[model samples]
Target: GKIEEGKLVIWINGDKGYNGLAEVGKKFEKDTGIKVTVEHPDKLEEKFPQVAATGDGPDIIFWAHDRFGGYAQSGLLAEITPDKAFQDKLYPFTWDAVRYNGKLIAYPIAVEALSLIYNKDLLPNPPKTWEEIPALDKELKAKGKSALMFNLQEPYFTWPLIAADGGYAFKYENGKYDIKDVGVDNAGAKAGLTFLVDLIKNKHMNADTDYSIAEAAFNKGETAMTINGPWAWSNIDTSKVNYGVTVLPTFKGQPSKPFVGVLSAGINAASPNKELAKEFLENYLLTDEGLEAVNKDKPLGAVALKSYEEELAKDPRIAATMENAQKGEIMPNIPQMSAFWYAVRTAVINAASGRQTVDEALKDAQTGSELYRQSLEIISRYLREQATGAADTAPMGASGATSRKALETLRRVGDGVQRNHETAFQGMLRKLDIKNEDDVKSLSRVMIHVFSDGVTNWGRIVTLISFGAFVAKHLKTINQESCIEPLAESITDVLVRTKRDWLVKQRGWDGFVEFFHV
Candidate 1:
């Protein structure tokens, strides 16, 4: 085996922290006599699938754990099960980062989370309760200094406040997510966001603050403290002042727990050297020496190993990061998480700017999440029906008053199908089958009729032919092709071929038709 030395290629991101893995790669090469080649790719996630499809991807990939699920689900990652001995080294919750469907999809590397970074010279000690923020602000303001500052426009910085009040993107129960139970509008979230909104409205904090402005203010000693992550440390002028880091202060008698994100290493499922990759990852990379090599350059964050974390804790920032991580929740890795960013952030931004009340913003965000979920569900159903060629299995039309109510909400909140269709287009395109010009044009006509008529005629359409039944009825008018073109593509192509210039003018009809066909 020593005589039959092999090569292992690893793909890492361009981040300085990730680039440090190359040193560990070199160490592995020396110890095992296996050549290790490390490559830094730009936009690894976007590039991985295309490269992997050609069977030219790296043997191992270093990236955030949230992306592991999509790769694993797509059969791009090998399932790894570290022994109990190895698992015992990491914090119990860190496992949540790389664990999917009860399988360890990757090796946990390091953690990055939010913490309270304050100027030690000004505060002398950290506050145990969040209420102290206002008192501190009042005292500092009299002396021409600010107590706290953070980018209010950025949702990531504000999420800790929402979470402190018990807000969550989705409900995780029995080791699985209850996708239907969205919590942005829950009472706890409302209370938490309301507190922050009050602060902005009262001028305790500015609504328009961004990262550069906040950091500059803190750096220039304009503010006494700030809530940020490890990345902010370098920008802080340590030569000018002394600073300390600690877990987020309590809010309303509850601890503020930020979302913890983990960076990890995973083996390519299609790698021919999977066993070697496994050996390198579990035996070498998980070892103290290997982890040391990777973390030497960037010591601000803690490694997954408990003992090593204790050692890194000697540094104040790393210690505070670890402390917050212990009290925090792992950033979820499900596909539904993609929907959280725009919806929740928009809500936070609106509330912060006084564009809407906290209640209205959060309620609108909750409604938006539901509509996105329903769109995904509809796409999934369309896929199954297309795969089975069983149009009669279940109707895609609104089934009851509940469904109709949801449709109305989606139509109203989203300002019609044009805005919402993009979210579901990929799913729609996957299983859509378009027959011929006649059926394509006919389907387009049906969409125009539906959009132009609204709920008044929707009731009539439902009675005449259930929404699903109507689609099927019209579908029968044209022949079926097993491997038909996508709905959006087919419709657009036919429109161009027929020179239907007038059809393009009705965006609602065009967009509505494109929604189903996509």
Candidate 2:
């Protein structure tokens, strides 16, 4: 992951934003002399896991935020928190999508989710509640049209209707979504499913319709409304359909919340372009001008930061889309969402096609989702519990061959060496004039010279231990004591993995037992 100088590669999940990316790519290359090659991989969602796990991938990846958890958990996505100045330029809600476990894991991306896209000419006043839909459906059907339609099978398109009467995919509590609390089969979900099924059975709604068919029907003035996202305008704007955007109809005063999807740029943790990646995102790609250039063709899912509010205000449709989006939940980006999509889709299909009662279908969804949740490893569950402070300590087998006695003595020896080398460490820090976090970080790279592997012995170990102690001291001096944890982990991980074999032999700490020569 060293700087792969002079070039950066980006893998975008789809073709939607090539125009904007092309413009920004040229500008960035002009400014920095670093070539930016943007790649559109057909199977980015599938391909990324393989490449990234092996420590190889594009410098940047552009995609929706829903799959973020898998990438972050697999250690494939880099954590990038913009400096507070840049952070202030973006919307807090946009940041919410890319953060995982309290760390900012991706850069700003546009935000929008499904909303009601309706023909103003056909039905000028949108329905305010579900009660209004049946009469509206009946009136529209007299003209051979329906009240609304969408890609009925798509979980994204159907989620609002499923959640219309308080249905939810998972229970969110204590600031986290619980996999154990899948609610697709709950009372509220059953009520919502019945409402959705009623549309197919009695409201002249077309369950067989997909996005294209549903959108085309609306475009041709065959229907008054269709449920979709902000991107629909890219086509419908050209369709000249007299369409307007608004929130979905509520059920019993409960607003239906579609799952919000955030489209963003994330750095591959294994990439050599980490430095340039952040530079490009913070200084160029996420700027208002950059957003304008990228979404100049059409606002990509409604440009998602406060900096672009002025530009967003130019279009009423996008403004409405953004308004509806804020009412929705950020689609759960955790890995368990993989199971949610298929499970919920199956449940909906079972009910929609009359294969099962709504209750039976929802029960199936609940069981299937919970089954996947339970399939996660016991260790994974333990780690999750531990992360939330609900787990007690557990024992595990050693990955090391080194005995406890040897390990204790190794620590003692490291402490002793650092103690004796204190003056040398202080002298080096003085020479380097260590005064801040940056200086300390740079010294860590410099210390790599002593570990060339040309030789390995007590002296190398001693020097490494001594250097780390001094760095911690300097970190404390600079009031960056929080940096010590990462510094300690890096030092210990590199040394333990590298020196374990040497330490296992009798020439190092392993020899202490034999050389009880005190």
Candidate 3:
């Protein structure tokens, strides 16, 4: 069947390694007597699922490693393993990037990570620790340059300091991501945010230091050093300014850990030419010859194969990139990572710009906003389940028509309550004081009143349960137990006293019994 089909199709994003891919495709066509074609789709990620379902997608797809998780979970990607020898050839971080749920889902091609890039003309020896930054900033400014500036507005660049102080976006444990165990609001993260805020307030850096400003400062030799990835190299004219690269300096006692991103290729599970695709990736495309084809247009990135490292390292920039990649944490590929970007970004921007205190910003980043959303999501889900009867008891009647009609009316009322609850809760969240003990206590007082009231407790019980569980789970994650204790206590009071005899008596003891189990 493979021989009869005699062709393999591949999809890639806009011009990423297209020349190399075409060269490799020509070789594959010549060697195997099979035609290989490559095409760029307008929206590959969105279109991939629909095409893969009909078994008409390309034999292979090339994209960033972060995207593999969704495709793997959606069953659009086939599991793959390069042999032991091939596996050993890749950098461990590069290999780690292509794994989703601990299974190898793609062929790793290139790796990128942030490193400390310094203008050699400014500082012959850069600061290796955070403590040296203040004095260095002063010294450089006195000499008409700023020391250690970066794109503080961008979370990806600022997160290194947070991570260096032991912050994390999500808890990665035992080879799986615990999406609920977010660490951005944790004490370590707050400490990191405080450090950044201190830098801004002390005038070591400014609020306006975004990517463009930071890049221009570094390129114009106005700043002694900056932290960035290899992508920024294209903008710097090497002939004009002497530069050097190294690992990001340590903060406190910990090394600054930037995220490592890998670019890769994956085989489509539904592709007709599985055998040819596998052979092409495993036997040919992974080889140095294949990568050479890729690197021919330009040095694409730090190659994954160990054999190519020495040659690539001849360029100091590539060597520094590799050093950082080895030290960096692999960027998470899980879907939950969507929440991390905006949360950290706003926290950094707000704190660095003096719009919010460090503790409050990181708290909201790590838990507050997410907690609010999760609370809403949990309550909404419970109401939907109640309306759908998934966790509801079937009403009793000979014809069942009366039961159905009553259930429909209940569903309609539940939807209305859901809408009102959301509006009220959002309003409450906006006005509530994050740090004031009395404010949360007063809100908890109201919550307890609604929770304990008979008429208001119907669909609202779900909110109490959901919000309580959210608070209870974060007790260990956050530093301030006092902030959560009052709300937690109120929820506990409701949970222990929510017997049907005490509230919602129309449903009687039987409904009370079902509520706990559900």
Which of the numbered candidates is closest to the native, going by highest lDDT?
2
Assess candidate 3 and give its lDDT: 0.68
Over 1-518, each residue of candidate 2 has an lDDT whose tens digit, in order, gives: 34355688888755356667878888999998989987888878768876887787788888788887768966889999678988887888888888888888888578867778888888888987877888898888888888887888767777876787778887898987766667787677888888889888984675677767887888888888888876667777778988788878887688888888888788988887788999888888887888878676555766766768666767777767766776678788786676677668877877888888998778666655554333222213222332233433443222122233433344455557767877886787778786655555555455555563537765565456546656665766567666655555445434543554454343333354344333
Per-residue lDDT, model 1, residue 106, is: 89
Give the Cα error of residue 304 in candidate 2, in Å. Answer: 3.5
The residue pairs in collision within model 3 are none
lDDT (0-100) at residue 148 of candidate 2? 81
lDDT of 3 by residue, 1-518 (tens): 12125588888875356667788889998899988887878878667766775566888888768767867865788898777887988888788888887799998888877889888888888778877888899888888888977888768888888888878876778967656567787777777778878887889998888887888888888898988876566566543778888878888888887877787888888776878998888777778898888676434568888787658878888888878777667888874454467568878888887787887678557552233223333333333343233643533322234234433444455445545576664554555534445554565456646566555444555455544433333432344445454554445434433432333233322242344432
lDDT of 1 at 396: 36
Instruction: Tell me the lDDT of model 3 at 3.
Output: 19
Give candidate 1 misplaced runs (Cα > 4 Å). 1-16, 26-63, 81-93, 142-144, 173-176, 230-240, 268-280, 313-319, 354-357, 376-401, 404-518
**Residue 113, candidate 3: C-alpha displacement in angstroms:** 2.4
Which of candidates 2 and 3 reaches a greater TM-score?
2
381 Cα displacement, candidate 3 (Å):
10
lDDT (Cα atoms) of all candidates against the true structure: 0.66, 0.70, 0.68
* Winner on TM-score (1 vs 2): 2
Q: Tens-digit lDDT track for model 1 on 1-518?
A: 01122788888765434545677777777887888888888778657755664566888888767677767765678888877988898887678789887788888877888898888888898788777777888888998998888988767688888988788887779967777678888888998899888888777898889877888888888888888877566657453768888889887788887878787888877688888888888777777777777666444377788877778768877877878887877888764453465568888999998898998888767755554344333333332343345632443342223333433333333333324453453344334444455544445554444433344222222221122322333344444432233333323322322322222222212233334332
